């Protein structure tokens, strides 16, 4: 309905009927142009890690609780003193303009509607200021792709601070792009503007070209960069892409106020483990000294419960939210979170867990299947 | 042949040719309306637990016994001093009217014909009194879905006592319904009356609406509820839905006279383990202090043998009996139990086990496949 | 080409081109009538054990030997002082008339041609005397299905002794038939005469009916029956169907001069382990005090090598030989043994094993796949 | 485009677009005659080992490294003081004339273009002198199939020394050919000349027939043969086909200056383990006393990284290079190495490994999938 550089964007704004989150992919495939769809759906190399992100949830099982003496489970929780209606949040994803003309503005509205946490992205088709304006008083985190150019870093961080963002997510697992075959097969050219890079170019970036700003992304990321971002913003800094206990501890020693356990939805180091399979050992080393956010493969209520029980404080979604955004805009995003909340409330009742803390204190079984 | 609220019910009354119990599903799918069929066949979320209920029987193997010195195995056993011709019994299932116009009356007749134990259900399309009348002197258990309304609980328990039921099964693993996609895809409305709720409404329920009685089902179930039902009936109370050793012991401490190991045929907490995979550890903690009933996934003689050898005293069937009920009414149900008895007698002879006690004392192998 | 009771039998007599033994099944399926084919190919219940008989060979691996200093491996071996050109032998199979009009006479000729050991069966379509006459001076074992009628047992054993048989195989794992669905689906009636039962009827059986003789098969088999057959024949008695170390030792204590590790090609106790998976523990308890024969699932050279390396002295084939018999009679059987010998000689060269003893002393790897 | 003995050879000379190395097989299948294609693609028996060569890379996982402080990974390495731009090399393969009229001359050019190590083969369609002339100053190893005729061995070794080859690869795992069904199904006759055997016949072989020279290949290979080749050439001798730690140590004790861990691409001892599954235990026994070369199943960047991290110094490719040779000659071979280098550089950046030594010192995870 909206065209940008030859690419068709959804303008839909409606509640959507959701059977489950996995089925949103084939539904969204009918309306997202083939190149954009492949960009969103695909992982790196032969997609082994992407597939294992789903299958790894079967490595642990939830015990049904008999005679639990609870009813009406509550999804409410908190991070950094911010109250949330649900522990399910939006993973930062820079390609939401591939799904919808409103991009992260509609995603921001959907998260605000369910009282969930929104993460806005460096490469968004819409500006930090626009996305925060769309969300109103709803809490937002800002995901930074750090540049070699500290003028770029400080300009985007100042824009995030002006937009009242509550934390910075430093993404460190994409210093180069994974080898994604879908984009090669589709001969796909990313067709969207990058509103934050355009704004920097027009402001403190003194007219520097967009391709030059893009190419300035840092491949060399050190612990001292974490402390520098923390000192500059006086916001909590969360390191995203952690897949080992040792890296969690190095991040906390470098000044991180949070650990985001992620393999980038299996789009980066193919042949790395399923994200779920390293969560518990990471959480054991962290020992609750900072909040943990988990993503990569979460689709069912049982998956969310298992991630919380294995040491996550919040659980993020990427692809299912992008598909819901294409299918129904702001109300489409709302529908995805409401659907997953419903599947989680059922599991919590059957597992005897009244609150999100009770889920976190739940002991999963470990039979081999 | 019979229509109720637009829904077609079987009136068949015939012996059926059974290749195996798994094949009854595709046979019954030709005659049960699509919505009713999906309601019966389906499990929760992605049906992982439902599938594992079948595959988990491969986690243990039966040793053939050479030079066993036995012939003509005997299927006879006992629970609470009640003699039975077979250790295979009917799992309580509230939806038998979806298969057949006689519902649990035909099931009661089939179980009486093989000298097996019948369990009648709270939500049956036919009354406690009718089902007990159909069974004649055959032993029956009554499955209770406990209400917040103790007038409802005491009325149904009094009706069960008047019908000479020998034990109460308290089902505790369905305080909310699992998320079952088949009913969403089929847009299925349960079309049957609930004869026990209608009777309560007309009697001690003083005209209270059916939907209001239904909605009064307790989500908060505590150990003290078990003792209260035991004190009120002076019958043995069996807790159904136990999937952990700790919950077995809590149930016995609360006054349970039996443990029913079940995950509700994978219809409830999807992402929970296969029922077979927790049976042996539950039976080790119970240490024969009360009888154990096992269900969820039982289809072959080898499955029944493995459940008895892993600590079950009785093994229940759900779906295969519902399918046989659709296909042949009372004689259809009889055919299902006779078929599974035949497969079990073959295994017992080849395994060198003369009696059901010998099966229970059998040591299964544990190679990994 | 030959008709018996409506059933078409092969009369083929030719060398056959063999890609591998597994492919003989689809080749033979083109020429064996559907009912006979299903009788041969099928296993019991859902054929899990039958399938695992094949897959279990992957549980161990053969190390290639570098710098082995050997060439021209030799397949020669010995049992009870009988010289054999190959450790691959014929498993006793009572249904060879379903494949070919000559039945075990052609099988006897094929085994004689490769210098292999033939086992003739109780229920053969052709007599003990005819099969031994067909084999000439080639060594034969006789497989007994023990009757309750010791007049029957002693008559067949006397006939076996007159035919110069070198050992008795007592089959003990088929006291009842496994539940085989193929025969139910095909509505298959065994159409062949049982030449040994007819001969008994005409001789010491004093005209007793064939069905009555057949029905006299013993379901109660005790250790004292083994010693009785040994005392009566003064031949070595091998117990067939052993799947546990304890049963191997009980058989040796009862007077057995050999152990035949078998699950009857997955036709009997479905839900029992793969035959290969219990071989090594049985061989560890036997500790070479008597020869071990292994069968059930052997198709490739690597399978034969792995069975010998895991404690077998001889490895038997059932189904592949029956299929080769249908396809080419005596030369068809010869072709099957020559093909498997060729695959084994290649493995022995690459594994650095000069003789069959070197294979038996080989240490298999145990990586998990 | 070129015909030899009825067989069509590629004459292509072009850069090729590569999605991944696995997809080269179906691309090359469109242009290689069916018999030649089956000869290249196939393994022995049922191809279990061939399949496991691929699946075994999933037995270990690469940890993404957060805050790694590196960029621009370097692929440079060294063997025997020879500088290489990449640790990926050409496995010796005697059938390159089945892909292309230039055979190993084009392969030699492709390896020279990426600064990689070429291995020329005994049975090549082109001579040792021609292949070395094609490669210019690029380093080459010569793979020997040892004869019983030491006049043959010394003539080819003298030709290799004259061609400035830097090491001898003694292949010891093909003393007989594996049973390869593709050649049986295709009725395939190897149609190419063997230029090295023809040259020997015309020179020191004094007119001896090609079939007679071919048939003189040694099946009996001893440790003293390794020392004899080392003494005669004064070159490092690498033993190829090692699959056990014990055989690695026996090879080093016999005078080997290198170990080449290989199962010949699953073409030899089917039922042997996946090559990757024995690499680490071999490397633990070798303890860096000599270089290790690894092959069999390598297709992705993650595979190369995992082999280096598990104790390989160099990683060889067979089939993918043969397919690239068919598709684009010298530039086709170049394209295959450039593609795999690109996938490896991405993994090294995401894993935090600056150099090939850093990859070798990387600790892989070992979760079970
Ligand atoms: C299309 C797409 C774009 C993404 N862009 C970003 C990004 O800009 N920054 C970032 O930190 N992660 C990005 N991610 C990774 C997500 O934050 C998240 O780790 C991933 O989507 C989680 O896996 P899931 O999609 O299976 O839920 C992206 C993921 C997708 C699929
Ligand atoms: C259609 C249907 C209705 C059911 N209704 C009840 C019920 O009313 N009460 C109860 O305790 N269990 C109920 N169950 C669960 C059964 O008691 C039993 O646990 C289950 O069917 C066992 O698994 P199986 O079907 O694989 O044998 C029901 C199961 C099915 C399939
Ligand atoms: C069609 C058929 C008939 C058989 N009849 C007999 C028999 O009469 N006596 C016996 O001891 N075993 C019998 N067996 C079992 C074989 O001796 C042997 O254990 C089996 O075929 C081995 O497995 P395989 O077919 O996979 O090689 C029979 C097997 C088949 C398939
Ligand atoms: C068609 C073909 C011909 C081969 N010829 C030889 C050879 O002449 N000498 C040798 O040492 N290895 C030979 N090999 C084995 C390779 O050196 C190497 O071990 C194998 O191709 C590695 O597995 P991959 O193909 O999966 O990469 C050959 C392999 C193939 C597929």
Sequential DSSP letters for A121-137: -TT-SS-HHHHHHHHTT
**CA D246 – ligand 4 centroid, Å:** 23
Tokens 């005293």 belong to residue: B313
A242 phi/psi in degrees, rounded to 5:
-65, 130
Q: Give buried/exposed letters for C274-307 (b at 16+ CB in 10 A, else e).
A: bbbbbbbbbbebbeeebbbbbbbbbbbbbbbbbb
Q: Does any ligand 1 atom lie closer than 6 A to the CB of residue A141?
A: no
Nearest of B305, B304, B284 to residue B296 by alpha carbon: B304
What are chain D's domains? 1-369 (3.20.20.70)
Residues 6+ apart with CB under 8 A from A91: A119, A262, A265, A295, A316, A317, A318, A321
Residues 6+ apart with CB under 8 A from A292: A258, A259, A260, A261, A279, A282, A283, A286, A311, A312, A313, A314
**CA A296 – ligand 1 centroid, Å:** 8
* Distances D297 to B129, D55, D107, D338 between C-alpha atoms, Å: 69, 9, 19, 18
Nearest of A247, A273, A260 to residue A53 by alpha carbon: A273
A297 CA closest ligand 1 atom index: 26
**B263 contacts chain A (CB < 8 A):** yes
**What is the per-residue DSSP string for D257-291?**
SEEEE--GGGTS-BTBPPTHHHHHHHHHHHTTSS-
CA C38 to chain CA centroid, Å, is 19
Q: How far apart are CA C235 and CA C150, in angstroms?
A: 17
**Is D309 buried (19+), middle (13-18) or exposed (0-12) by CB count in 10 A?**
buried
**What is the per-residue DSSP string for D230-246?**
HHHH-S-EEEEEE-SHH
Nearest of C268, C266, C271, C257 to residue C295 by alpha carbon: C266
- Residue located nearest, by CA, to atom 29 of ligand 1: A93
Pairing relationship of beta strands C88-90 and A292-294 according to DSSP bridges: unpaired
Residue in B20, B346, B367 closest to C181 by CB: B20
Residue in D268, D274, D277 closest to C64 by CB: D268
C-chain residues within 8 Å CB-CB of D144? none
Scanning every residue of chain A, which has its alpha carbon at the shortest distance from the alpha carbon of B218? A71
Neighbour tally for A73: CB within 10 Å: 22
Scanning every residue of chain D, which has its alpha carbon at the shortest distance from the alpha carbon of C341? D179
Q: In the PDB record, what is the listed experimental method?
A: X-ray
Radius of gyration, alpha carbons of chain B: 19
B319 near B296, Cβ under 8 Å?
Answer: no
Residue C98: DSSP 8-state? G
Ligand 3 test: best mutation among C267, C303, C320, C321, most atoms within 8 Å of CB?
Answer: C267
Q: Is the dihedral of CA A17, A19, A21, A27 positive or negative?
A: negative
Please give, rounded to a whole number of angstroms, the shortest distance from the CA of A164 to a CA of chain B.
38
Q: How far apart are CA D318 and CA D94, in angstroms?
A: 10
Q: Where are the alpha helices (DSSP H) in A203-318?
A: 210-215, 223-233, 245-253, 276-286, 301-309
- Residue located nearest, by CA, to atom 15 of ligand 3: C264
- Taking each helix axis from N to C end, the angle separating C319-351 and C301-309, rounded to the nearest 10 degrees, works out to 70
Nearest of D124, D254, D237 to residue D171 by alpha carbon: D237
Pairing relationship of beta strands D2-4 and D7-9 according to DSSP bridges: antiparallel
Q: How far apart are CA A110 and CA A43, in angstroms?
A: 26
Residues 6+ apart with CB under 8 A from B223: A67, A69, B250, B251, B253, B254, B255
Nearest of B149, B298, B150, B297 to residue B228 by alpha carbon: B150
Q: How far apart are CA C145 and CA C219, in angstroms?
A: 10
- Residue located nearest, by CA, to atom 4 of ligand 1: A93
CA B309 to chain CA centroid, Å, is 19
Q: How many CB pairs under 8 A join C and D?
A: 107
Strand spans (E) along C228-281: 237-242, 258-261
Q: Does any ligand 3 atom lie closer than 6 A to the CB of residue C102?
A: no
Please judge whether D69 and A226 are an interchain contact, meaning their C-beta atoms are less than 8 angstroms apart: no
Resolution (A): 2.0
Pairing relationship of beta strands B88-90 and B314-317 according to DSSP bridges: parallel
Q: How far apart are CA C324 and CA C332, in angstroms?
A: 5
Scanning every residue of chain A, which has its alpha carbon at the shortest distance from the alpha carbon of B185? A19
Q: Where are the alpha helices (DSSP H) in chain D?
A: 24-29, 34-41, 48-55, 104-114, 128-135, 150-162, 181-186, 195-202, 210-215, 223-233, 245-253, 276-286, 301-309, 319-351, 356-360
**B215 contacts chain A (CB < 8 A):** no
B327 near B29, Cβ under 8 Å?
Answer: no
Q: How far apart are CA C207 and CA C209, in angstroms?
A: 6
State the best of B56, B176, B249 to mutate against chain A, taking most chain A CBs within 10 Å.
B176
B148 phi/psi in degrees, rounded to 5:
-60, -30
Tokens 């012991």 belong to residue: B249
Degrees (nearest 5) of the Cα angle B185, B186, B191? Answer: 140
C-chain residues within 8 Å CB-CB of B57? 271
B199 near B159, Cβ under 8 Å?
Answer: yes
Q: Does any ligand 3 atom lie closer than 6 A to the CB of residue C241?
A: no
Dihedral, CA of residue B80, residue B81, residue B86 and residue B89, to nearest 10: -30
State the best of A350, A359, A363 to mutate against chain B, taking most chain B CBs within 10 Å.
A350
Please judge whether A62 and B185 are an interchain contact, meaning their C-beta atoms are less than 8 angstroms apart: no
Q: Does any ligand 2 atom lie closer than 6 A to the CB of residue B264?
A: yes
CA B88 to chain CA centroid, Å, is 10
Q: How far apart are CA D353 and CA D351, in angstroms?
A: 6
Q: Where are the alpha helices (DSSP H) in chain A?
A: 24-29, 34-41, 48-55, 104-114, 128-135, 150-162, 181-186, 195-202, 210-215, 223-233, 245-253, 276-286, 301-309, 319-351, 356-360
Q: Does any ligand 2 atom lie closer than 6 A to the CB of residue B178?
A: no
- Residue positions of A annotated with a catalytic role: 264
Pairing relationship of beta strands C167-171 and D88-90 according to DSSP bridges: unpaired
- Residue located nearest, by CA, to atom 1 of ligand 2: B40
Q: How far apart are CA B183 and CA D139, in angstroms?
A: 68
Please give, rounded to a whole number of angstroms, the shortest distance from the CA of A328 to a CA of chain D.
34
Helix-then-strand count for chain C, H and E: 15, 12
**CA B93 – ligand 2 centroid, Å:** 5
Specify the DSSP element, H or E, that contains C303.
Answer: helix C301-309
Q: Give buried/exposed letters for B29-42 (b at 16+ CB in 10 A, else e).
A: eebbbebbbbbbbb
**What is the per-residue DSSP string for B32-43?**
S-HHHHHHHH--
B-chain residues within 8 Å CB-CB of C181? 19-20
Q: How far apart are CA B204 and CA B196, in angstroms?
A: 12
- Residue positions of C annotated with a catalytic role: 264
Please give, rounded to a whole number of angstroms, the shortest distance from the CA of D277 to a CA of chain C.
8
D181 near C19, Cβ under 8 Å?
Answer: yes
Q: How far apart are CA A307 and CA A313, in angstroms?
A: 8
Q: How far apart are CA B337 and CA C361, in angstroms?
A: 51
Is the backbone of residue C255 left (phi > 0), alpha (psi -120 to 50) or beta? left
Q: Does any ligand 2 atom lie closer than 6 A to the CB of residue B318?
A: yes
Q: How far apart are CA D171 and CA D145, in angstroms?
A: 6
Nearest of D358, D117, D149 to residue D260 by alpha carbon: D117
A-chain residues within 8 Å CB-CB of B271? 57, 61-62, 300, 302-303, 305-306, 347
Nearest of A144, A142, A131 to residue A174 by alpha carbon: A144
**CA C40 – ligand 3 centroid, Å:** 9
**D222 contacts chain A (CB < 8 A):** no
Tokens 């046989």 belong to residue: B324
**C349 contacts chain D (CB < 8 A):** yes
B339 is known as an active-site residue? no
Chains contacting chain D through 3 or more C-beta pairs under 8 A:
A, C
**B172 contacts chain A (CB < 8 A):** yes
Nearest of D161, D171, D144, D112 to residue D293 by alpha carbon: D171
D279 near D310, Cβ under 8 Å?
Answer: yes
A-chain residues within 8 Å CB-CB of D346? 44, 176-179
Residues 6+ apart with CB under 8 A from B212: none
Ligand 2 test: best mutation among B318, B323, B324, most atoms within 8 Å of CB?
Answer: B318
A50 CA closest ligand 1 atom index: 26
**B296 contacts chain A (CB < 8 A):** no
Please judge whether D277 and C367 are an interchain contact, meaning their C-beta atoms are less than 8 angstroms apart: yes
A61 near B272, Cβ under 8 Å?
Answer: yes
Please judge whether A343 and B241 are an interchain contact, meaning their C-beta atoms are less than 8 angstroms apart: no
| Tokens matching residue C67 | 């710098």
Q: How far apart are CA B60 and CA B307, in angstroms?
A: 10
Residues 6+ apart with CB under 8 A from B369: B58, C52, C55, C274
- In DSSP terms, B342 is beta-bridged to none
Is the backbone of residue B269 left (phi > 0), alpha (psi -120 to 50) or beta? beta
B45 near B362, Cβ under 8 Å?
Answer: no
Q: Where are the alpha helices (DSSP H) in C167-209?
A: 181-186, 195-202
């Amino acid at each position: 309905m909206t065209m940008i550089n030859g690419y068709e964007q959804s303008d839909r704004e409606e509640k959507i009927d959701i059977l489950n989150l996995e089925s949103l992919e084939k539904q969204a495939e009918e309306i997202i142009p083939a190149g954009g769809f492949g960009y969103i759906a695909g992982g790196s190399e032969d997609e082994w890690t992407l597939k294992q992100n789903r299958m790894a949830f079967h490595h642990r099982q939830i015990a049904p609780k008999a005679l639990s003496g609870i009813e009406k489970p509550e999804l409410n929780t908190e991070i950094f003193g911010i109250p949330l209606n649900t522990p399910v949040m939006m993973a930062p994803a820079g390609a939401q303009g591939l799904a919808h003309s409103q991009g992260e503005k509609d995603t921001a509205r959907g998260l605000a509607a369910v009282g969930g946490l929104m993460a806005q992205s460096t490469y968004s088709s819409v500006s930090i200021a626009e996305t925060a304006a769309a969300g109103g008083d709803a809490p937002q985190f800002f995901q930074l792709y750090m540049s070699k150019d500290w003028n770029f870093n400080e300009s985007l961080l100042d824009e995030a601070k002006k937009a009242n963002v509550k934390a910075i997510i430093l993404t460190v697992d994409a210093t180069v792009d994974g080898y994604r075959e879908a984009d090669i097969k589709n001969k796909f050219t990313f067709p969207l503007p990058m509103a934050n890079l355009i704004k920097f170019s027009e402001g403190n970036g003194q007219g520097k070209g967009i391709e030059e700003i893009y190419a300035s992304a840092a491949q060399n990321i050190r612990p001292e960069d974490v402390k520098r971002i923390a000192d500059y913003t006086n916001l909590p800094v969360i390191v995203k892409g952690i897949q080992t206990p040792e890296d969690a501890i190095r991040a906390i020693d470098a000044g991180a106020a949070g650990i985001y356990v992620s393999n980038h939805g299996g789009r980066q180091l193919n042949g790395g483990p399923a994200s779920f399979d390293v969560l518990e050992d990471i959480a054991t080393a962290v020992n609750k000294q900072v909040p943990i956010i988990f993503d990569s493969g979460v689709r069912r209520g049982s998956d969310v419960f298992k991630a919380l029980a294995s040491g996550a404080d919040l659980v993020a979604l990427g692809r299912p939210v992008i598909y819901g955004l294409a299918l129904g805009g702001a109300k489409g995003v709302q529908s995805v979170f409401e659907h997953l909340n419903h599947e989680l409330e059922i599991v919590m009742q059957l597992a005897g867990t009244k609150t999100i803390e009770d889920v976190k204190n739940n002991s999963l079984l470990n039979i081999k299947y």
